[PDB]
RNA sequence: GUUUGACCUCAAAUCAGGUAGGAGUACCCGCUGAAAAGCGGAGGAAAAGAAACCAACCGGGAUUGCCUUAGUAACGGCGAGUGAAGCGGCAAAAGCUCAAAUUUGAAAUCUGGUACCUUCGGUGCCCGAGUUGUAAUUUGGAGAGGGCAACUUUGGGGCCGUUCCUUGUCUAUGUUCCUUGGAACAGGACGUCAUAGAGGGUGAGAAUCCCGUGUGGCGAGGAGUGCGGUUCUUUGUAAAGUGCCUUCGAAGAGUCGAGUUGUUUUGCAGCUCUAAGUGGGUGGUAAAUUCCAUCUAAAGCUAAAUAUUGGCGAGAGACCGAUAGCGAACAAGUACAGUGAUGGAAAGAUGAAAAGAACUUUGAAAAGAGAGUGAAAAAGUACGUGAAAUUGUUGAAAGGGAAGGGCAUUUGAUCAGACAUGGUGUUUUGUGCCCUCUGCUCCUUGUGGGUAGGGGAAUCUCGCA
RNA sequence: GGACCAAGGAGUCUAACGUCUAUGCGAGUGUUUGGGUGUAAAACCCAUACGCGUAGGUUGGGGCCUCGCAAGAGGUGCACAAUCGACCGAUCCUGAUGUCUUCGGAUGGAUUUGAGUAAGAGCAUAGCUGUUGGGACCCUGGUUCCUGCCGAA
RNA sequence: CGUGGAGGUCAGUGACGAAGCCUAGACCGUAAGGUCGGGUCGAACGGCCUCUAGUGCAGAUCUUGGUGGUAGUAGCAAAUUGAUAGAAUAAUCUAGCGAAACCA
RNA sequence: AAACUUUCAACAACGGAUCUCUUGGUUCUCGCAUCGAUGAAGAACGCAGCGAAAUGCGAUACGUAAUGUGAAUUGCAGAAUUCCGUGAAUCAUCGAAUCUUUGAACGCACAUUGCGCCCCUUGGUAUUCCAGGGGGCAUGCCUGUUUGAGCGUCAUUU
């Protein structure tokens, strides 16, 4: 506060461009999945909240000590003295099949296949050595694949 | 002369990073799937360690491609070489266990 | 400031010994030794002649160490928890703390340390259920999980025996936290440390029977002046 | 106590905020509590005072006096109420600069901005 | 053909569109360099960074930074002392792009202009650029051509939310009685709130007077693809991936290196010389006409972990409290000084409110005196408080060219000097926790504690009077 | 060396070894690079590494026991010291059984050796202090409270 | 013994007067010093157990500030539309202004 | 004896020490990344009803417009608010303008208030002449458009 700039900006009639950030940098929204956004708690931690989920937070070998957090009573050894839920929800969601579309055929090339289907029929060695309407000289079996896709699409 | 007065502070900031990054990576872990790799240097040759990445051939032995495996969060090193049997097999079992526990969204 | 005549004796000159940052601020402590200090503080909190010896208004409380049910943890409103401590009988300690608010005599009054007052009860919980918000507004009360048990909160001003209130589950959990001869420790390689003397009373040992058998007869306990 | 980090509790910062406050913030600072009757009227405790309304004095040496505010002297964090004056030895008159924390508003001067403000503060405005 | 035209080069444009400079410079990167200064260049970081690496192991695996290695190795009139690195643990993690063989069944590429459109752009048309090579595909971890078998996959918008930023607004409880005070925010009694008893203001220490504080709520305007729903379309023999088979299967040269010189402590630079392709680099290894290891130099980009006495903001302090703390709490880099480069002070507090002394009078004028305000001018814009050195007057004493203290005592002056006023025994009368009778109640349940009603001192007895 | 007076004004901090003392643990010890946690620069918990250390006799003799009323006598003997030993390493000779013609050390000597074996003591923190270096008490001169005890050359 | 600050405590003191100042006022301490009276004064401050230090001054021709004597002296631009005036003829006195050196 | 000197006390001076505050430093931590030829920083000159510094502004000059709030400002003077509002305010916010002369400083010059050139507009008798107003005109570099030039090269009888 002893630079000439800071003193002038202090004495100026502008006022400081003041923005407060330090409160809101601790809290974060998770932004990504609404399911985790539901089960997120903003209180436990990244670590405790992932543990309460059931998802493995860090992959492997944390430095330091985890909270063993006193789940059980451990008794001394005598030395022989003398006498899941949200996991299930995401598992359903990933298990949920998406509404997929079959990759269809284009009208010109299925018409081309339709020309081949009437010109040669079904046999492939004749249509492979056909010049007219096989000018791209398609592969022996690519012909089969496209014709079987066309037949399953149309014409049995 | 420098004193780490910010040692308490930076850790907080670092966990803020470990918070904030985690916010973007919300289901996924922060870290990738790293190999378990035995160390060099006879002082340390009994020690096993976290390695950088597995190999191409090992990920193929796991039954997937490394280009796809980077999307699954499996760290892959091409320039490493697999030369020990038990290292290879244990890391394959590690890959299989990682495959068992993931669920991938389409 | 670094560079900011030239004499320590001079007006406006540089001072003798410019105070530098790299003077030691934090002090390294052996971990067993720190745990030992906390253990002695916890053991001292039971006694309550020590708690009166520090200064607390605990003369009308049910017993020592004072243990309340775990339901105390489930209180989430200030007035209910204060009424609960009335029902305990630590009301006089709270009134002591509330009357004790004085202004700081130093210059540090205008260094954001303006007010000072005594310390009161310490509530120990196993688990928060809104209790720490409820007791936050009442002065002098400070809460602590059994896992932490802050020494500064335990023996403030290095005086042993602050007045400590326990919840029921926390009091059971203290066995988990420090272990015993039966329960292990829950701390890695820690043992509740031993005594060098078993009996705490020396005058009991001196006046027992058998030392009193083995010992020669005593003098007048003040010397008879001769000549 | 102070829970947000963005709130500060420095005495020096707080006084530098107080004495260098712009006037629009000052009329928020220059606030007076309503009467028990006006709280029974509108359901609201304190309000930013202006000059048109009527007030009573509840502290100070001129305690138990009342009047309409002559002018709000916002630059001195103060408020001149009419007819509460010191009469000098020339015979002239100068009002006591009162402070709205020591005042209790008796009769409000209601305006559309004022009625909407009472509405937004939860008032049961007639 | 003495003509005409392609180019190519070079000019010119008050042609169109862009861009460079300077300031600052804490951190960063280069260059220069003494007994640091300087120069140049950037950014929010920069640099470095995906091995021509480290190792010798059961090998590791971009860079960066921390701890350890370690004050070790090594160096050094092996003197002064100088002074690493591998590994390990951690933080952070991320990888990619060119240059080499043809798309030749069609330069498939892009700037610009213009016309429109849903404009960080799109479409169309037209000039150009470009084969002395712009696109697609391929960077060794290969890859490409095909073929086979299958599978597996599709892209682009919108909108509304969400997320982020910038804001706006709402969200408790005494001003209850008494004393003191100029002023209650002080003291006492009785309260209420509290996820709010941080802080500040209000005429003195204010949870409850005000602002806030705390908890939540409602908005507003943007940023945005981060994802979440809806909605509109998207195929064209389009693009890609995996296994097997077949045929191929091209990479950084004035560089590597060598000598010398300077410089550094081995690199770098200059000068001269200057390569290879089962190549080259680097290191161990030997039972030796050795074997083995490990990378691919001479092209490029890359977040994060990192530095930051600067900027923009915050939040704090076992810091200083006006000779301190910044030179500077104040109209401080000021007044001032210097020709200049530059140097560089002193200086905070009336009061709660100016209520800042109406009016009379002396007085050139300055200053007074009456008077008054104020709680206080023992606060009068010379102003909180107001020490010492030093000054003036009065009083006392001493001295006469006398200096100071120590002891001890007079004399003179002077001060202090009970809120002391009771105890023991006896006696009179009266009263009650005394006596008697009748209770109630708390537990620590006894060698207890509290408490009521009526009667009596006629007799006794205790305490009190 | 001095006109007076007021205020300011001179052994501070840090690093490396060293003694002493206190404290915790103990052949181990050391949380705080870092991670987890939190009421948030506090406290609390700690994985893997790392650091430093670890890896016979005689004479007495504190005591203790017995006896002795006591005085004393006898016995067992802490620490430590002296002796005589032993062994390891070295020392210089012996040079075998074997021996690749120069390999070998077997055995026996000899003195000393050594923070040697012959049954650990260290690590960490704090305090006070010693030496050295950072401006290092301040600028030859100066160098800030009292009392007690010890007190030279 | 004393000083600034810090933790605890005395439900310490305080506008019916804290702190500070003065005190030919008393008291306790061997002393360092401490306690009270009175006066002034106006808003904070102490005792105890601990922590911490920018912690104790007569000197350093120490630093800064204030005030002396020198001294009403030197002397009169020594700092102050234009210039010390007055008188001595327009060639010593009064008046006004007024130092410094130095100072167990 | 007075006067003078010394000492002490009283009151009054002088002085600013002490005490108490403090919109000031000082240090630490956290976040952010943002100056220019679309003219920076810096300088100069002015702007307020009555201003010296401080701040703010640029001849639209302690400001204009916009948005929000909702009655002020205040040393004096003076407007007001039709007040249930298109509304004071030295208010806040600020995204649209203005922005004097310089300054990387940019028409050429410069010890000049020297000398221009081009374009647009208006008027003064206006076809000539003059006046006014407005806007451009620095260097380097890149890409493109346009105009040339070269004894550079080549072609040139279907």
A18-40 b/e (C-beta count within 10 Å ≥ 16 → b): eeeeeeeeeebebeebeebeeeb
Structural domain total, chain D: 1
Q: What residues contact residue A61 under an 8 Å CB cut-off, 6+ apart?
A: B50
Q: How far apart are CA D32 and CA D45, in angstroms?
A: 9
Could you tell me the two tokens for B45? 């040759």
- CA–CA separation, C110 and D55 (whole Å): 36
Interface probe for A, chosen from B9, B22, B100 (most Cβ of A below 10 Å), is B22
Mode of pairing for the β-strands spanning C66-68 and C164-167:
parallel
Count Cβ atoms below 10 Å from residue A46 Cβ, excluding itself: 21
Please state whether at least 3 CB pairs lie below 8 Å between chains C and A. Answer: yes
* Run of H or E including D71: strand D66-73
Q: Are B103 and A90 in contact (CB under 8 A)?
A: yes
Alpha carbon separation from D44 to C203, D29, D56, D91, D115 (Å, rounded): 71, 17, 17, 42, 12
Residues of A in contact with C186 (CB under 8 A): 68, 70, 74
Shortest Cα distance, chain D CAs vs residue A36, angstroms: 26
B56 φ, ψ (degrees, to nearest 5): -65, -50
Question: Which chains share 3+ C-beta pairs under 8 angstroms with C?
Answer: A, B, D
Task: Spell out the alpha helix ranges (H) of D1-126.
Answer: 11-19, 23-29, 36-42, 112-120
Residues of C in contact with D9 (CB under 8 A): 112
Sign of CA dihedral A6, A10, A16, A21: positive
3-state secondary structure chain B: CCCCCCHHHHHHHHHHHHHHHHHHCCCCCCCCECCEEECCCCCCCCCEEECCCCCHHHHHHHCCCHHHHCCCCECCCCCCCCCCHHHHHHHHHHHHHHHHHCCCCC
Q: Is A3 exposed, middle or buried (0-12, 13-18, 19+ CB in 10 A)?
A: exposed
Quickly tell me which residue has 């059980």 as its tokens. Answer: A72
The DSSP line for C126-138 is SS-SSHHHHTTSS
Tell me how many degrees the CA angle A74-A76-A82 measures, rounded to the nearest 5: 150
DSSP summary character for residue D53:
S
Strand order in the sheet with D54-57: D93-98, D78-87, D66-73, D54-57, D103-107
The dihedral through the CA atoms of C56, C60, C62, C68 has a sign that is negative
Residues 6+ apart with CB under 8 A from A57: A46, A47, A50, A51, B29, B30
Residues near C213 by Cβ (< 8 Å), separated by ≥ 6? none
Please enumerate residues of D whose Cβ is less than 8 A from a Cβ of A. 4-6
Contact D11 C136 (CB under 8 A): no
Please tell me what resolution, in angstroms, this structure has. Answer: 3.7
Angstrom distance, C206 CA to E380 C1': 81
C157 CB inside 7 Å of strand G: yes
Burial class from Cβ neighbours inside 10 Å (0-12, 13-18, 19+) for residue C109 reads middle
> What's the CA gap between D111 and D116, in Å, rounded?
8
For A75, phi and psi rounded to 5 degrees?
A: -105, 155
Q: Which residues pair with D94 in a beta bridge?
A: D86
Distance CA C186, CA C44 (A): 22
Residue B98: domain span: 1-106
Q: Where are the beta strands (DSSP E) in chain C?
A: 66-68, 102-103, 115-116, 122-125, 142-145, 164-167
Q: Which residues of A touch D6 (CB under 8 A)?
A: 20-24
Three-state DSSP class for D35? coil
Interface test with D, best of A20, A25, A27 (most D CBs within 10 A): A20
Q: Considering Cα of C54, then C59, then C65, then C66, what sign does the dihedral take?
A: negative
User: Residue D28 sits in which domain range?
Assistant: 1-126
Give the angle A106-A110-A116 at the CA atoms, nearest 5°. Answer: 155
Number of domains observed in the structure of chain B: 1
Asked if the Cβ–Cβ distance from C176 to A73 is below 8 Å, we say: yes
C164 closest CA partner among C39, C35, C46: C46
- Residue C86 parent element (H or E): helix C78-88
Nucleotide nearest to A2 (CA to C1'): E326
Query: What CATH code is carried by the domain that includes residue D10?
Result: 2.30.30.30
Q: What determination technique applies here?
A: cryo-EM
Residue C131, both tokens = 């209790």
Work out whether strand B36-38 and strand B48-50 pair parallel, antiparallel, or are unpaired.
antiparallel
CA-to-CA separations, A75 to A69, A82, C42, C186, D35, in angstroms, rounded: 16, 19, 22, 10, 68
Residues of chain A neighbouring C175 (CB-CB closer than 8 A): 73
| Cα separation, C218 vs B25, whole angstroms | 83
């Amino acid at each position: 506060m002893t630079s000439v700039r800071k003193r002038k900006m202090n004495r100026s009639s502008v006022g400081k461009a003041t923005r407060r950030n330090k409160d809101k940098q601790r809290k974060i929204n998770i932004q990504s999945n609404p399911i985790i956004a539901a089960n997120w708690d903003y209180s436990l931690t990244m670590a405790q909240n992932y543990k309460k989920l059931g998802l493995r937070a860090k992959l492997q070998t944390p430095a330091g000590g985890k909270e063993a957090d006193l789940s059980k009573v451990v008794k001394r050894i005598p030395l022989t003295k003398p006498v899941t839920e949200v996991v299930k929800k995401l598992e359903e969601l990933a298990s949920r099949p998406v509404i997929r579309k079959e990759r269809s055929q284009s009208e010109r090339e299925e018409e081309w296949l339709e020309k081949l289907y009437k010109k040669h029929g079904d046999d492939y060695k004749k249509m492979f050595f056909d010049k007219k309407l096989n000018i791209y000289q398609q592969s022996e079996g690519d012909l089969k694949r496209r014709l079987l896709r066309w037949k399953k699409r149309n014409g049995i | 002369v420098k004193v780490h007065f910010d040692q308490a502070g930076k850790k907080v900031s670092r966990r803020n990073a470990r918070a904030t990054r985690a916010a973007k990576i919300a289901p996924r872990p922060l870290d990738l799937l790293r190999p378990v790799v035995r160390a060099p240097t006879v002082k340390y040759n009994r020690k096993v360690r976290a390695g950088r990445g597995f190999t191409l051939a090992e990920v193929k032995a796991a039954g997937l491609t490394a280009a796809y495996a980077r999307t699954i969060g499996i760290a892959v090193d091409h320039r490493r070489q697999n030369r020990n049997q038990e290292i290879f097999d244990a890391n394959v079992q590690r890959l299989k266990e990682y495959q068992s526990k993931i669920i991938v969204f389409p | 400031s670094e560079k900011a005549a030239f004499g320590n004796m001079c007006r406006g000159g540089r001072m003798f010994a410019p105070t530098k940052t790299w003077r030691k601020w934090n002090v390294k402590v052996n971990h067993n030794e720190k745990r030992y200090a906390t253990a002695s503080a916890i053991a001292a909190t039971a006694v309550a002649s020590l708690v009166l010896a520090r200064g607390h208004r605990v003369e009308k409380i049910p017993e020592i160490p004072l243990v309340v049910s775990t339901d105390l943890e489930s209180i989430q409103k200030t007035k209910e928890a204060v009424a609960a401590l009335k029902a305990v009988g630590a009301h006089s300690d709270l009134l002591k703390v509330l009357k004790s608010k004085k202004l700081r005599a130093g210059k540090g009054k205008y260094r954001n340390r303006r007010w000072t007052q005594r310390r009161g009860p310490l509530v120990v919980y196993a688990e928060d259920n809104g209790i720490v918000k409820a007791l936050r507004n009442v002065p002098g009360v400070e809460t602590a999980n059994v896992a932490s048990l802050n020494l500064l909160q335990l023996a403030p001003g290095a005086h042993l025996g602050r007045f400590v209130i326990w919840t029921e589950a926390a009091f059971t959990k203290l066995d988990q936290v420090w272990g015993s001869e039966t329960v292990a420790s829950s701390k890695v390689g820690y043992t509740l440390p031993s005594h060098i003397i078993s009996t705490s009373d020396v005058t009991r040992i001196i006046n027992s029977s058998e030392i009193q058998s083995a010992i020669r007869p005593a003098g007048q306990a003040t010397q008879k002046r001769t000549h | 106590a102070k829970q947000s980090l963005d709130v500060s509790s420095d005495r020096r910062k707080a006084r530098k905020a107080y004495f260098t406050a712009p006037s629009s913030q000052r009329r928020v600072l220059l606030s007076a509590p309503l009467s028990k009757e006006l709280r029974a009227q509108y359901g609201i405790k304190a309000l930013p005072i202006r000059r048109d309304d009527e007030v009573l004095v509840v502290r100070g040496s001129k305690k138990g006096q009342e009047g309409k505010i002559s002018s709000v002297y916002r630059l001195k964090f103060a408020v001149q109420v009419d007819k509460v004056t010191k009469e000098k030895v020339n015979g002239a008159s100068v009002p006591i600069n009162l402070h709205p924390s020591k005042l209790v508003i008796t009769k409000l001067h209601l305006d559309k901005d004022r009625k909407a403000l009472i509405q937004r503060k939860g008032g049961k405005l007639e």
